[model samples]
Target: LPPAPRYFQGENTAGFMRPVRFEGDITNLEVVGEIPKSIEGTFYRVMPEPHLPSFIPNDPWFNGDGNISGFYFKDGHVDLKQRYVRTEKFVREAEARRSLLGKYRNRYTDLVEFKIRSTANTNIVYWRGQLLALKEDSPPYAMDPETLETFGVYDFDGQLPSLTFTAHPKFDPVTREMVCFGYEAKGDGTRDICYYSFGPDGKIAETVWLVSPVCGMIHDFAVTENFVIFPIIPLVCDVERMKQGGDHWQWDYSIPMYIGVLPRRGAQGSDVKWFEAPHGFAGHVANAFEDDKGHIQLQMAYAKDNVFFWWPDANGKGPRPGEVEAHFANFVLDYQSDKLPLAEPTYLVDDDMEFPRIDDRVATRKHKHTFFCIFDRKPGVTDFEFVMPRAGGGAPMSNGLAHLNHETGDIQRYLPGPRKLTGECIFIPRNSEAAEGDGYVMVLLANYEDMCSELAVLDTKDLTNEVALIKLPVRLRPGLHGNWVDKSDVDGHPAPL
Candidate 1:
């Protein structure tokens, strides 16, 4: 076996973005300030890390294999464990000692015969007794909640027939049911979207089949009490493009975007309503709820152009870093009206941001607060002027975390000075009886200056200071999404092997 070519050691695959392939355990990490003994459980996150160099160099940063990291908090101390999801791709590549896969989600470029085509590197979710690693183009890969051991492809015990499962799934606080949908439900590049609901027992409860207005990447959706809202962005997909050895998606501004709303309860494909939206780029819903007038209010980090610098436009041109900005905005729509409501926006904050998260307990309900990473690009603030290409391009220059009070429209932020960047954060409630948004916000910070990572915990009430700053021995590649699993929910599990 030969070492990776120079391309693998360059750009997205180099520096802090390089792959961390080994799995290990670290106990009693160094901590500044205090980690409340009461704050117990695991903060689980997944990063895109390829065990072997990509068959095609310069592949999308998202094409790397899945690696799950666990930061277990117990009795004022934190233990760390990192493991790779044993997907068929990972296992086969390991046995062969080389890269076997091709482009990101473009199977036509595969160099070897592979069936279970998924990296599962996008998101990690603790659902109903199991921890499932997810990628938008493939089925969920099941893993042991405590051990982080991969159990391979999980299709809800063979109940999920769709070829894909969304990386983002919303759980109803009142019912404890998981609402999820899979785009390209029929096959690769297909427009079919399948909606599913899983009960607290983890069994499939509801399935609705619908087709998107265009075959595109529906990265996320918003769920209200009565409706499931899907954003069909202009990042359109074409099978021929993949067949020609291209990407799975391309930015096509020729067609207008669409927002589809379906009844959360018994709804068929024909029952779905489509609202025309402006041709803009947005992913990751901050929150959504129905207003008193029975209208859906949606919040997302909205941008006028593609934020993904690598994804090319219809003319095969990609946007440069800082060419576009995605900011938090509130959009109003009425699904019941005969005349579809255009997605009108109210800018909540006019700063570049992404990965908006709210208290999970308030999901699908009228919520007062939202927390997200905001971009801070002041000159001389950081060691380097340019954002790292592996950090998902410059559009997401998330240097700080912002806490927004939706009721008051005031924003409080925590910026970790220079040479540091933050990733998606999760809200950890102070207690079961704590008020909504009353908790500590756990965010992962990458210290590029020191070339290491640290976990910062800040009080939601006051983001000006951090309650705890836990330092880790190893650095982590910027991650996509993460979640916090309560200690009581994951208690009494088998000891780590």
Candidate 2:
């Protein structure tokens, strides 16, 4: 265990973005065609793997180590498991066999007892019956949504007030409730903002404790039916640049970019409200509503600046060659106007998209089909090269999976042919009263000449065929969010031992 740096052998961990630490279970994943008896449950995904070796050197691939992966689609067969979310900083770097962290979210270069732990990678939610694992700087680590194991820290029993928690959570299909929010939420580099919701019997029905007009990096938000946005992306978040150790987020397109807006019923902190946008950079929201006059709108994935481009921007520069790509915009917001709203162009899909998904039963109303992840490429091929390597930054690198149609402005796609590459597309719905995006799109394919990983399943009323692909014998590394639980709508499984 002596050799590891060069950020573990460079080119961003080589091929299919290597760095898989190996965990078990794989029963029947070998299909290539038929597997939709209505496509049973599971899916799950989570990845930011750094089993050891982060004594520093580049460090931020969003600080790895949370590896979940599950799959499982019963009845049409397809099972696979994979764990490693034993947080406590992955069991003290696997019982001290190496690097105890440093960098990314720098806590003065860490190890004061692993300074505020949690590398629960980023995003993986099934809340209310387990399987948390998110990471917005700590506080969600439950697991075992059917044996992906790891059941450690998951407050909400203590009623979760905020040590941070939000890898993007929002369920509210008319009030089944889950809605969350936490940006530097009372933890490292604070600007405090909590707002939780819970209920469907997992208790804690509403909390709200706002503040964030600054300390940035709010990654993903917007839930409407009566508001709850929070945009704020100039990325900043500096606790004096993490006590001078720096790098949790830096880009500062000259600041100015706020959004806040509250009122999901009672809301506080003077009932929130901020507004003011335009320094670019938006990173995932994909759905938001409220019409009939009050105006809310929101649909997400914008950018005229930093799509992570290696963090640099307090002056170090980055994100200016054609503004680093990221389309699909629509903003809107006019919570009784403070001015500057309606931000333009949703001419639907002009290609170049981001992670935006929709149809968790029209989450928070007024919806009309939307699914994302489209980076085209492969057309006259032009010497393609991106077997997953955006390294320290996240999201961006897809071969296609679009399907937008907000009433007559259609656009459907699938395109995972040609060395593959596409993840973040979990639609599903061909059952519970279909017709929001009409169902099925499971995604996750990184085949870079079969170094491994497959899963496709498209068919939202035919995205040009492909109702199955399952595959997979390895490579699941490049990940940043995943969902799709069904097993007849899971009710916290656990009764046989």
Candidate 3:
């Protein structure tokens, strides 16, 4: 790795510190939404209609343009632009404030929800049906992606709410249904899964079923022909101490984690099964595709020698140092048997790696073999070990994609060289006609040293040959989750309505 270039300076010109561009080129795509305020301050009143824009630069963190309500993107656009449609303001005087606050605080303030629908199937996209953290007196609103509108606000002033739906919505191909999962706002970190049917009139049918008591925050999920699988990966934290700035507790021992499976339409919390694995492995349950043998496939990563701790000093005060060790390991789960079985661990790469963005595909007429990427720190040492000798003892380098054999557990590592920076690796199956060239894997490379990002299409069979590099000027923050939307609608329009 080389020294990082200073392409842009941190400024608070807008109310908030503008996000620095680390990769990619600038484009017309925009991202707009409300800027949430910190919890330390009291809700203040905005005078004279409250729709004013504030601009300040150079502040590490500042509130800018009124809260963003939505974001939009155009095809082939690199820079993402946002649109702000809502602003927090005083709708009434002291008397009105007393009435509105009394009625809406718990109902509205407790829930924050958003929605996004893909063009492929206008009927299915991502949405949060109900958000309880916004206002206590109001009900969850149905979010609209097209107009960025929210509807179906209900007044639930007295009834004890059963569940708050906030998980990202996903469309299941095998089940042909839209599914979502959420946990109780105040209860233990348990989860509930629900689905909606597509009706002829474009409206979603009633709730298909609920899956609950599934612990841990669900970063993502996968669906098979008969089962929906959830990997139980908990965020290491102390619930009681976290409320007070996470300053009181000691490092605890790591615990065993598991992959949970349930009938796609079964009753919530019943008829569920779990396959336990060795302790300390945690990664997103990326995608599940059927293999040639017809068994559902599962992929996950293991943490190497890492432990989370919360400790209170002698004063019983807050603000203590939290520590995490790095001994990350990666693993795969085979769900072909009546009882889910854990296969031999495949140690792809090591370090204090966090996120493992993977794109997997089973061999078919269009392609052969399964390909996955481990976006992690280089092995041997931690602390952003992007530049290190490869397993074959080559020179040090930054982020790269490793092609793996789902069956034989074979591995082939490919580096993007020292000059090119890389973001997440997205692999498109070989047979897709939309693929830019003769390649199985299409990766996003963010050249931070140059302050730009580009797309590198790689041959899945042989990653050394670079097929195409689509360059962009703007940089993108490393995101946790994103899906490749099928861009095959009329005139390149979105597939969904």
Candidate 4:
């Protein structure tokens, strides 16, 4: 059996991380406001939930199993379903009745038979007629779109040249294709990466071999119409450290980040160029596109300090006392430069934000706004400690959804009331032909007082309170990322084999 967790009780416990312990099918979540007649399809949310405690005390949050929670919107009602991604790791642990895994994505700690495991716990998406649960370190795990059941692993029909896939795959609106890649494609310390593209039919259209210096943590990347930009920040990898049982990567703030840009046309590795950026990290990107002058502009949420202090750096420092919150920042890269290129950080928003969302159809083009989940500072609680105020039990420690208007620095927010926390915001287009962001933004809200959850919808153009809210009797853990599938594409469609 595994050891007792250091954070056995409280916020890091089952209260927040492992809210729902078991996996089962559910239906007919209670509704509050009238369901929008025009809204149709499924909203899939993927998150990590540990069925058993870790072998290591004070285990990392990124090591949990994937549990997918989804809401199917249909004729004036919603269907609720949750399922644990039945990866090989989950089955083996169940058979042994213990957590057979070791350090996060590190094979140096596990027994010979038990290898590195990918929980597929980070994100979920609907593409190529299949719903997939994803993690950056391994192949995508396929799931039934309507039923949310485990189908198997996806390998592009045995044509996947790499052992790994991606957590964030870029979808091209005009071409109707999925753009993806795998870092450390050969193994833990190898710099061999694979670039892949899937046609609208889900079959691999192209797979190319690429290389980078130093196997760094490439959690997410950006896809423009002409290039794939990889931002290799300080969360770097070291083979020696892995052998010594150290955390995967450390925030070495002293080192500068690298920006690698490769042509979307499968350019040679020698033809690819690299640039330098400020020292920091940004795991998720909002959007990327090219300027009229052939420069690349990438929008992201960045923080200079170590956000998660448990994975200590080589210097052995935890969270530092500073004002480096993850805020929206824009970086520009020059592909046709004679001198060394340096990414300039242009301001996007002042408030602390992450999980930035922009209209998928407007990707690789000029974007006006980005809808995201914001962390509003609590009145009495300190950042280090999430101590809820006793003054009538003030509002949630953090919760807010708003859009950052880059054109005007203007923002609009909607309140979900006290003690009601919100997850990463999602955007659903009202009409395919409508202007960018002229649609609805969706946010999942969980109430601590009521022990229930709801989905709040707001107008993308203006952030008033929910235009509609779908209430649920079941509580929800904080979800990682979700995709909103159109009813026409998913509902009543035959399953993809």
Candidate 1 residue lDDT tens string, 1-497: 22445345556676778767779788899999998889888999998887887757676778888899999999899989999999999999889878878888788877777888889999998876788999988999999978888887998878896888999998787777889999999988788999999887778888999988788889999999999999887887888978998878888867666789999999899888888777788667998999999989999878778777678786777678677778788888888776665755788887788899988778898888899988866675554654353243311457898888988888898988677888899888888777878888999998876778899988887897989999986888877889998876442221110
- Decide which is better by lDDT, 2 or 4: 2
Deviation from native of the Cα of residue 217 in model 1, angstroms: 0.8
Model 4 worst lDDT run, 10 consecutive residues:
387-396
Task: Please give the lDDT score for candidate 3.
Answer: 0.35
TM-score of each: 0.95, 0.32, 0.53, 0.91
In the range 1-497, model 4's lDDT, one tens digit per residue, is 33544334333444444446567766776766676778888888986777776666555667778999888888767887888998888888878767778888787776435543789898998876678889888999998887788888888788778888889888777677789999989988788889888887767876778787667777889998799888876777888988998777776766667778888885876766767777777658999989888888889877776665555578787574233478788888877775544755877777777888887777767778788877777653232233232111111234677776777878897667656778888777776566767778888887666667788878776686677788777767666889888776433221211
lDDT, model 1, position 431: 80
After superposition, the stretches of candidate 4 with alpha carbons farther than 4 Å from their true spots are: 1-11, 320-323, 341-343, 378-398, 490-497
Off by over 4 Å in 1: 1-7, 341-343, 380-383, 386-395, 490-497
lDDT of 2: 0.76
* Candidates in order: C-alpha RMSD to true structure: 3.5, 21.4, 12.7, 4.0
lDDT of 4 at 363: 73
Top-lDDT structure, candidate number: 1
Global lDDT scores for all candidate models: 0.83, 0.76, 0.35, 0.74
Deviation in Å, model 3, residue 425 alpha carbon: 2.6
What local lDDT does model 2 show for residue 448?
70
Q: Which regions of candidate 3 are displaced past 4 Å?
A: 1-18, 21-170, 185-215, 236-254, 289-296, 304-398, 405-412, 429-441, 459-462, 489-497
- Predict model 4's lDDT versus the native: 0.74
Model 4 CA lDDT for position 245: 89
Task: Rank candidates, TM-score, best first.
Answer: 1, 4, 3, 2
Give candidate 3's error at residue 81 in angstroms.
5.0
Model 3, residue 483: displacement in angstroms?
2.8
